[PDB]
Amino acid sequence: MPTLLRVYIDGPHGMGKTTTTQLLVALGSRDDIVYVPEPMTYWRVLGASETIANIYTTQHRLDQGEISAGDAAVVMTSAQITMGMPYAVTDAVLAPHIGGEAHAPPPALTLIFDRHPIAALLCYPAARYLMGSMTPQAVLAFVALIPPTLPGTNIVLGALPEDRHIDRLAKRERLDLAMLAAIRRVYGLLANTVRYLQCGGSWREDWGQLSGPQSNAGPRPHIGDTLFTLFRAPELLAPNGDLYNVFAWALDVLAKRLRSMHVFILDYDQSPAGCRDALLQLTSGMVQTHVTTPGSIPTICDLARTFAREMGE
């Protein structure tokens, strides 16, 4: 009965996520912790050409008024489905090896990932919807495709003052503060959504309360402070006023996929070593899982090294 610890580092770009996780990985034994890094190689080359470059210019040309909404939406939608592929595929090959949950002895293997599938099938799409470059229907199609949430899905979101974030961000993608505001808002919403569901929130019961951040602590947030609030869009509403059932079912799925997640908030308003040690203290309350076969440890380990080996920076 060997155990596994899976930790997905996620949240808005530009906070220091990659650095903190390399630092955490650099403390461990080469063989008891493996990092699944950002698939930069799939991105700029393998899946398509310069994927991040096509996105930031299309929104920039949508702002100006050089290309309509529909035009930007088709480009944003296809960019996202291609961008999320590595996360989805990783999740699908690992799935069969993950047993039930399980404080406990040291995990036999710790897998740290640069992002979870929900960044590409939920968060980024919702942020683009708020920026006007994606339709709500398309965001819900992404949501309906989120894979079943595996036991022990530990997701680490980040915290950081916007002023420090804007400054960290300005390093050299283009300088898009509106998008920065939109993605921070969506991740704030995401943490509250997990809290809401874990405290027994039923969006169907509270839908009517809509008009006009901690993920594992505190009281139940108001539905207005969760991701459900984004789906009040007239496009999704029938002539009767309520959501078409098709979109309501997607919110049911959103609710199911996030209800079982374990979310932690890491403060990035610190030096790199500071972030590392805090992430390392956080991993202590995270949930481990048993693996289905005995050979899953080495198997999974190989899968992760291969991904790192072929798709990093």
Place this chain on the structure above:
Amino acid sequence: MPTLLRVYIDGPHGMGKTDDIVYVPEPMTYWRVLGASETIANIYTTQHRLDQGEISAGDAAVVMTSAQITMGMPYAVTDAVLAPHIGGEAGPPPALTLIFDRHPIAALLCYPAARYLMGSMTPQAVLAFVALIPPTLPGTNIVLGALPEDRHIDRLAKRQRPGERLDLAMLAAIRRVYGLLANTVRYLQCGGSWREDWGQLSGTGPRPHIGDTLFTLFRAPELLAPNGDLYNVFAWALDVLAKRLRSMHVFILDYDQSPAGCRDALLQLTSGMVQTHVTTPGSIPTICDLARTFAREMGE
């Protein structure tokens, strides 16, 4: 704890696919209005514009990819809400028989693979859709069609959907994809290992040759490294495809006959389909509710 029989009627369109049995119809209203405006027309116009040289290959692919997301949404949301109610295999007549108009693989693999063959979708986008195919649950019975090509052209010509353009090149492509699909399931069911037979594509139990399966489509140069090796991320996606396809139960329905005949042939095929148990006492009625509400809201 009652039994359920799920039957997905799929295969290329245009062949004739149009109380204890519920029928989940084609979500035409989602395609023409709820998810977007006239998605079929946008698909067919885009391919037409590419064919005439009015737009680029890259341009048509972004348009196609986005429209395929819209086309697929109803199946994917349907599978996600239904999945939790599906239990293990049971094998007597079933408590409920749910007949669906298409399975998620139509939109997350077949149509996409066919547009890749029409030069309007990248192979990488096709594999992004495949990676998102939902886990194959017990009792996934998929009915595929058989019909000679000229009878199919006749039938399709009398059956055009709103915004569709009669395109014989897309007909051949979708037909080829579906024939490869049937071959692929048999290849996997008889022990075929794509990784072991990959070398047979690039330089030459009893089952189809891998060149006669969907794996042959993924020998696309965009997915290979400079030394000819398939990138691991794509090899992964093929591993998922084998896993999803191997456990489906495919039934072939001969459509070269009358609706009466087809109806009965379809009912005849039901004897070898696999039934499951549901997981709750309220699953039947809830499933039932889902089915009728989908039909009312999204059915033409």
